[PDB]
RNA sequence: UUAGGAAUAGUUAAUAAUAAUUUAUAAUUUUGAUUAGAUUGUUUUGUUAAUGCUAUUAGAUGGGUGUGGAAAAAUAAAAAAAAUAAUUAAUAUAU
């Protein structure tokens, strides 16, 4: 427990957390230029289980 | 050290012989650096080679750890080898942290030993001529980093004095110039063991004229005039040694007044014959010497017609020579040793004892140990890296001291033989006969 | 205030320089507020303090601030390994309490210093003091037909392979385990007396049973464990009805020895019958006299078989039980993420034309670009540096020696390649006669901690020893191009690090939903 | 935890394993050689059926002994089995021990057989401590022995809680091999102390002091002090008044002295070149032999008191 | 001050208690009043190795490609549903389950009822919150057979650790009012053959002998021996 | 103590120095130690 | 308190005025002000025949956080800090 305590830096060892605080603490200061768009086509494609029970159903309904 | 960049490891990407720091990769990454051969400049601050300079020499003891005698050889070998990489440049006022004139705030050693507002305003440019003596700006163009800690601790001592505690009484300060290695506190106490030991010989003996081998900074003269004995003399290689230990026995008041500082290699000149100076015979000889991590372990025989011993062994063996034709009868010598010669080579035999037993021209007249009581660097040349004494091999370690007499002059001290609690040889009891 | 005594003359004020708290938070890796761009492939040295090296920074020192992807680098942690101790219940007393659960890790080192005062014979220490009896227990597993121990070493293989890697087709795994001790016993025929590395599986002999439901312990009574070890161990299913192994996680590095056809020892060499070419001017002594190298043992001669150590599913624990010379191999994968990462980072930062200088720290305006630019020149050098170029088969790729002792810690990533040497003693080479020749006529004074090797188709084995202790941990996530572009190091340094290795990455809309 | 292993049951043997059958509550393994495996099975037996809280096994072989158990302790009746046990035999615990083993001998055995045993353990990577063992049978079985343990110093730091468990005073007397020499030179000790006993209490009767109950009352308060003084004071004085009795036998024997003391002058260097560097020990060991051959070996040790001149008999022929 | 734990008496800071009154010591911090607590550490914290080998799925992510198997979907439901379970019951997943959320009912936690401890809750109204795992909850407390007068909130209502009986005759439709179920001193005449008092004012339970043994085994007066 | 005028006391509130312990140091176990 | 002595001001009072849109011949200072320099004070120190000369080391601290009764809060060998941890003694610290 104390050796949990001890990797914070608390001055007086209280059983507190207090958390360290770098220089760079935000994604666009990071290089990020802006938030990542996530590609709507690719993952609106339908999964590989999908696909084999759409062929199951194509062979079970004819 | 001017650097040659066409035998450098890379003169294509770094044309200068050197990789500037500029103060943001990591301290591993310049330690790889200087691993593999490269030297190690810094780019604008000197905050930069100093945290370089730290952190190296930490980690390079923990991928040699000093395990053993033969493991201490090795890591003073590759932390020399290290550590001469680290360079600063020849102008070091054009660095930022160098001084500040209007914050009166810097970086460096110098804020341990002088002022904010003296080294800002007058004492960055007495420095800056200090090193111009030893070291000029034309021959040199970069500086080990461990030549300019040193030379920033040489110019304190030229500024100001530098106490010898527990030796000298809180007011007596020395100045060793440049070159001179001064004493740490593991250096101090087999003087403070002999200090205490001539505090209660001294007319037990009647010891008067005091010979002090080896000087150094003097520290091994100064403290035999604190004792009693009236008529010292050092005899020491470094002529600017001699000149600064003469200027402080001036400056230390009217109790230093018959000490005397001659240059010899080893003893005093006895070169005329007519001018007869042998009627000075010294009753006591004093020989503190050096033991580095270099010169203990490579103690070897080298020479043809003129056969003599290397290192430490081959020092003693001069003292143990040369030592009768200066002594007196009824004259001892007095030798401060301090056990690291059996820790870090324990294969050879005893140099000491191999003098008492074998070539039977001294007799162990007394012997005394005692335990090392603090920490520091041991014997440390002036313009290397420090490398203080870890924690093992500092409680094996022992302040030594070895009084030995003539083999002549037995009957003299064979009443000193006989008393209960002394140890007789069996040479000195056959001269006794009741 | 302070009583003071009072002087007619003025008072000095010092700013002197203490050790700096930021240089040992970067020694012992647990600084927390470095932003360094510019992820290279050299392995970092991490020298373990007191209390001061846990999960939360060797997360940190996995993934760095300026948005990894991957943990591409291996990470030397001197002194970081640990011990733990059987925990039990106590049925005495007033209640029932588990105690018993304790770490012997940065109080009780490895290799005690052997200082004493009185062909010249020296006392070291040059193996794990701690886990020797669990090494032994393991050594005395393979003591001795033949065939009985050819099948036991081919039995016991980590998951099949072993960290070999050969080329197998339409083969099952109990055959391929086979194939491969055939194919080492194959290769190591010629010589009279050789040696090959493998990852073995704790033997039965190794695990004991108690009584109270089953637990299974170790036979020394000490457990190797990494305390700043980050993620899940590795679940290893136990073949003989699948069910778990319970220490598949803990491994062992085997050096085997083949048959075809504590008291270290110096001796001082002599010879019978331009020194610092780096100085322009000449010295009428050198300024470092003697130089100090590291002695490995010799490798025989060598189609020739891989013989590389790549754990493709798993992320390496090496607890060194000797001292070892890795020589690590680096994978096409983290070499090609450093570039495009430090390319990416080049051309979105640095915009201008840069000039054109002759080199990288020229005279003129520091500019962000001459600044990117001579940190990028540095990271280059210290990559040229430390590493070497070795030929392969068409190959060639960066190789990094590591000289990893007892009681370290080395994380190796998956994927990454590395061959084993032991290492013999230290050599000092002076400085004067290696400028004239080789440095193997230019030896001075030679120790010898390792006095091993002794001189007494298919090839027989000799022996087996432990030269470490191999920690299997389960695969380090890899970030994708959202979660790496959205991951802060400001938000994990208190918590989310266990939901960060549980759960695949970090979430891509963390802390700003 | 590590598993313990002992080896031989004797008269000595047996209260040993017994011990660790008690002391260890099913935390410390139990293995059980001995010279038959008919006297395992008994010894076994004789713990299953007084009440056993650990599990125990039964071997006849050395091997699985070595392959089961960590630290074994052997408890012999003689040198020469120890010598057969521990290197002789081609199932040998130390020429083939593991290394990380830890080998205990309490037989008292020569100093050469001790070194011989710690350089090929050492030479295996194993640790041998020999702890040779003075006390009484019911001394052991109370748990009172006297241990002197040689060989590594954490070997000994990690043999001290196995080593509680059957006696109270154990010593590490440093490097192997002073740990049997520590039970020659007691004995010798003890030898010598019974000498000067029986003579001193003979010089009594020879100066006409008729109150013996006093004088040793003020010998136990002066500087000539033993505990051998105060032990075979009241039989010496019925052996010395009474010269026609025959002295009682005991446990302990004058031949069972001599077999200790028949390794010492084995241990000992060259003595020939002065014939004597050790005057009282021999001054002892001479009428100790004039003791043993006259038909009193197996009785008590003050049986010495009517063989004091009979010391004299080989100082002045052989001179 | 209102309630002194035996009077003022200061030989020593432990003699005053671990809290100087039920009220709170400063007026700012009303969350210091003194109340019966609940060890949310090992109750909040479910055990997350029922969840192994089970993929979960993220709100947000309603993307095709994310979608599982609706076996490894059911079995993922099974898995959560084990997992909200594995500790203990809530309020809120008791009450779910039962007839007109459970109005009515005596919820009561595992201590409530041992020892000479008696005390449930007659359950009278819910909030349920969206996520229906948590909310509001409120009852008649009944501590001994007295009862309270007016419904009040139940303290770690969230926190799992819950019992109820289900019996149809107490359930109350949401159409009605939950009634307060009655003190047995006051409201209906005291008898002794339907309700016996275990603990009153004034009485302490008797000693159990096993710990006396281990009492008197601590401190060295049994002879406590391997 | 009570069993089963001197005021008697409860052998339970005050109990009677159980003789499963040993003495470890006496009144006997002094010795003197003369200084001037 | 100043070896070479002159001006000072978020200013003084009144006020149905918290939080001053007003009134006044306003306030300090040659009986020494403000500023600048030196600056913790203090029958505790030293000396002497001395109501003389000469010394001082209790302390406090309008922007770090409106928390807390009170900012005194970035570091102090005890001031033992909510179950008798220990209360025989000496080192009580190095360790
Ligand atoms: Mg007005």
């Not at chain 2, 490269?38 to 604008?44: I, K, R």
């Not at chain 2, 010497?289 to 290192?311: H, R």
């Not at chain 3, 778990?244 to 803990?250: D, E």
């Amino acid at each position: 427990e104390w050796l949990y305590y001890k990797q914070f830096k608390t001055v007086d060892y209280s059983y507190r957390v207090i958390p360290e605080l770098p220089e760079k603490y935000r994604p666009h200061q990071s290089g990020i230029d802006q938030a990542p768009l996530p590609d709507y086509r690719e993952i609106n494609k339908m999964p590989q289980w999908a696909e084999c029970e759409e062929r199951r159903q194509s062979k079970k309904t004819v | 050290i001017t650097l040659r960049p066409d035998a450098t490891v890379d003169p294509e990407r770094y044309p200068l012989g050197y990789v500037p720091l500029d103060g943001s990769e990591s301290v591993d990454s310049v330690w790889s650096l200087v691993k593999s051969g490269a030297f190690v400049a810094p780019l604008s601050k000197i905050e930069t080679i100093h945290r370089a300079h730290v952190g190296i020499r930490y980690l390079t003891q923990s991928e040699y750890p000093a395990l053993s005698s033969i493991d201490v050889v090795g890591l003073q070998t590759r932390l020399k080898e290290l550590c001469s990489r680290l360079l600063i440049r020849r102008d070091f006022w054009v660095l930022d942290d160098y001084n500040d004139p209007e914050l009166n705030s810097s970086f460096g050693i110098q804020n341990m030993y002088f002022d904010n507002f003296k080294w800002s305003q007058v004492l960055w440019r007495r420095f800056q001529q200090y090193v111009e003596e030893y070291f000029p700006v034309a021959e040199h163009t970069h500086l080990t980093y461990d030549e300019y800690l040193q030379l920033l601790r040489s110019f304190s001592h030229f500024e100001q004095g530098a106490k010898l505690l527990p030796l000298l009484p809180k007011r007596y300060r020395i100045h060793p110039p440049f070159g001179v290695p001064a004493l740490s506190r593991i250096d101090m106490e087999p003087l403070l063991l002999y200090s205490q030991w001539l505090k209660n010989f001294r007319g037990p003996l009647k010891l008067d004229a005091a010979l002090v081998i080896r000087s150094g900074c003097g520290a091994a003269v100064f403290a035999t005039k604190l004792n009693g004995v009236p008529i010292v003399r050092g005899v020491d290689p470094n002529p600017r040694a001699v000149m600064s230990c003469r200027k402080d026995a001036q400056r230390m008041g009217r109790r230093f007044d018959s000490i005397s500082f001659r240059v010899g290699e080893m003893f005093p000149d006895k070169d005329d014959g007519n001018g007869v100076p042998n009627s000075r015979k010294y009753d006591i000889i004093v020989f503190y010497p050096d033991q580095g991590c270099y010169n203990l372990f490579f103690t070897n025989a080298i020479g043809e017609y003129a056969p003599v011993l290397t290192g430490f062994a081959g020092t003693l063996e001069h003292f143990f020579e040369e030592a009768g034709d200066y002594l007196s009868d009824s004259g001892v010598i007095v030798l401060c040793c301090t056990n690291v010669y059996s820790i870090l080579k324990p294969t050879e035999p005893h140099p000491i004892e191999y003098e008492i037993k074998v070539n039977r021209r001294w007799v162990l007249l007394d012997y005394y140990d005692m335990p090392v009581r603090g920490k520091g660097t041991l014997s440390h040349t002036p313009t290397d890296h420090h490398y203080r004494i870890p924690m093992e091999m500092r409680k094996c370690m022992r302040s030594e001291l070895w009084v030995l007499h003539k083999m002549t002059s037995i009957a003299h001290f064979a009443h000193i033989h006989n008393i209960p609690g002394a140890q007789p040889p069996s040479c000195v009891v056959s001269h006794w006969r009741n | 205030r302070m009583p003071r005594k009072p002087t007619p003359y003025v008072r000095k004020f010092l700013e002197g320089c203490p050790l700096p708290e930021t240089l040992v938070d970067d020694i012992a890796g647990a600084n927390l507020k470095s932003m360094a761009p510019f992820f290279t492939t050299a392995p970092r040295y991490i020298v373990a303090a007191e209390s001061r090296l846990s999960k939360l920074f060797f997360h940190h020192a996995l993934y760095p601030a300026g948005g990894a992807r991957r943990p591409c680098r291996v990470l030397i942690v001197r002194g970081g390994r640990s011990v733990r101790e059987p925990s039990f219940t106590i049925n005495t007393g007033g209640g029932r309490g588990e105690v018993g659960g304790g770490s012997r890790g940065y109080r009780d080192p490895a290799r005690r210093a052997y200082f004493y005062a009185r062909a010249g014979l020296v006392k070291r220490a040059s193996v794990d003091g701690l886990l020797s009896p669990l090494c032994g227990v393991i050594e005395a597993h393979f003591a001795v037909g033949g065939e009985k121990l050819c099948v036991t070493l081919a039995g016991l293989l980590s998951g099949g392979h072993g960290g070999l890697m050969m080329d197998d087709g339409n083969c099952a795994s109990n055959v391929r385990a086979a194939k491969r001790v055939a194919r080492l016993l194959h290769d190591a025929a010629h010589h009279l007396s050789s040696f090959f590395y493998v990852h073995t599986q704790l033997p039965d002999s190794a695990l004991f049973v108690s009584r109270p439901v089953a637990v299974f312990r170790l036979a020394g009574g000490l457990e190797p464990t990494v305390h700043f070890a980050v993620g899940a161990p590795l679940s290893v299913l136990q073949r003989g009805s699948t069910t778990v192994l319970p220490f598949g996680h803990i491994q062992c590095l085997l050096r085997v020895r083949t048959r075809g056809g504590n008291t270290p020892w110096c001796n001082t060499a002599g010879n019978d019958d331009i020194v610092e070419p780096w100085k322009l001017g000449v010295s009428l002594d050198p300024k470092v006299p003697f130089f100090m190298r590291t002695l490995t043992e010799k490798r025989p001669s060598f189609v020739h078989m891989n013989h590389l150590l790549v754990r493709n599913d798993c992320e390496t624990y090496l607890l060194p039980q000797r001292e070892l010379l890795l020589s690590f191999h680096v994978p096409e994968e983290a070499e090609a993420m450093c570039k495009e990462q430090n390319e990416e980072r080049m051309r979105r930062q640095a915009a201008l034309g840069y000039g054109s200088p002759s080199h990288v720290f020229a005279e003129g305006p520091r500019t962000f670009a001459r600044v990117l630019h001579g940190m990028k020149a540095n990271l280059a050098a210290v990559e040229e540096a430390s590493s070497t170029f070795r030929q392969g088969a068409s190959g060639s790729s960066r190789v990094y020696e590591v000289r990893a002792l007892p009681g370290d810690v080395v994380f190796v990533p998956r994927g990454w390649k590395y061959s084993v040497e032991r290492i013999v003693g230290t050599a000092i080479i002076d400085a004067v006669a290696a400028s004239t020749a080789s440095p193997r006529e230019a030896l001075r004074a030679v120790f010898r901690t390792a006095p091993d090797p002794p001189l007494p188709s298919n090839a027989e084995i000799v022996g087996v020893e432990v030269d470490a202790f191999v920690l299997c941990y389960k695969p380090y996530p890899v970030l994708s191009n959202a979660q790496a572009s959205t991951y802060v190091a400001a938000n994990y340094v208190h918590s989310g690090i266990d939901d960060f290795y549980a759960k695949g990455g970090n979430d891509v809309y963390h802390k700003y939903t | 935890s590590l598993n313990v292993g002992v080896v031989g049951m004797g008269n000595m043997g047996v209260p040993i394993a017994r011990n660790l059958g008690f002391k260890a509550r099913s935390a410390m393994y139990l293995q059980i050689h001995s010279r038959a495996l008919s006297k395992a099975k008994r010894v076994c037996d004789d713990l299953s059926v007084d009440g056993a809280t650990c599990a125990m096994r039964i071997h006849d072989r050395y091997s699985t002994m070595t392959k089961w158990c960590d630290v074994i302790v052997l408890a012999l009746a003689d040198v020469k089995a120890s010598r057969h046990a521990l290197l002789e035999d081609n199932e040998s615990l130390i020429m083939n021990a593991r290394k990380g083993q830890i080998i205990v001998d309490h037989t008292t055995v020569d100093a050469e057989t001790s070194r011989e045993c710690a350089h090929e353990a050492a030479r295996r990577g194993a640790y041998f401590l020999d702890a040779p063992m003075s006390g009484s049978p019911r001394a052991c079985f109370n748990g009172q022995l006297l241990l002197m343990v040689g060989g590594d110093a954490e070997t000994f730091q990690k043999m001290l809680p196995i080593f509680h468990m059957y006696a109270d005073n154990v010593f590490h007397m440093g490097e192997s091999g002073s740990g049997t020499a520590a039970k020659m030179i007691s004995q010798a000790l003890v030898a010598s102390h019974n000498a000067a006993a029986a003579e001193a209490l003979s010089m009594a009767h020879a100066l006409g002091i008729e109150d013996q109950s006093k004088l040793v009352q003020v010998l136990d308060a002066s500087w000539g002090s033993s505990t051998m003084l105060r032990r075979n004071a009241p039989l010496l004085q019925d052996l010395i008044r009474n010269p026609d009795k025959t002295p009682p036998t005991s446990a302990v024997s004058v031949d069972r002295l001599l077999s200790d003391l028949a390794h010492l002058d084995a241990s000992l260097p060259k003595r020939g070149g002065e014939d004597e560097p050790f005057p009282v020990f021999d001054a002892a060991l001479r009428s100790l032999a004039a003791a043993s051959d006259a038909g009193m070996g197996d009785r008590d040790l003050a049986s010495v008191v009517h063989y004091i001149e009979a010391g004299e008999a080989e100082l002045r022929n052989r001179t | 001050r209102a309630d002194p734990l035996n009077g003022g008496s200061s030989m020593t800071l432990g003699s005053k208690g671990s809290k100087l009154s039920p009220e709170p010591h400063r007026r700012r911090m009303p969350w210091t009043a003194a109340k019966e607590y609940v060890p949310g550490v090992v109750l909040n914290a479910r055990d997350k190795m029922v969840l192994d080998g089970v993929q979960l799925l993220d709100i947000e992510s309603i993307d095709r490609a994310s979608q599982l198997d609706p076996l490894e979907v059911l079995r993922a439901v099974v898995a959560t549903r084990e997992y909200n379970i594995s500790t203990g019951k809530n309020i809120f997943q008791l009450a779910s389950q039962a007839t007109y959320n459970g109005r009515g009912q005596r919820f009561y936690r595992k201590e409530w009822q041992e020892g000479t401890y008696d005390k449930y809750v007659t359950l009278s109204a819910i909030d349920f919150d969206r996520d229906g795992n948590k909310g509001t909850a409120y009852g008649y407390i009944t501590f001994h057979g007295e009862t309270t007068t007016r419904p009040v909130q139940v303290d770690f209502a969230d926190v799992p650790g819950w019992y109820m009986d289900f019996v149809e005759e107490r359930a109350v439709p949401f159409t009605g009012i939950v009634p307060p179920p009655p003190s047995i001193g006051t409201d209906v005449p005291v008898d002794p053959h339907s309700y016996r008092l275990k603990a009153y004012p004034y009485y302490d339970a008797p000693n159990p002998p096993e710990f006396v043994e281990r009492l008197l085994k601590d401190r060295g007066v049994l002879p406590d021996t391997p | 103590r009570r069993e089963s005028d001197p005021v008697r006391y409860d052998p339970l509130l005050v109990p009677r120095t159980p003789s499963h312990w040993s003495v470890g140091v006496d009144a006997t176990d002094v010795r003197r130690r003369w200084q001037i």
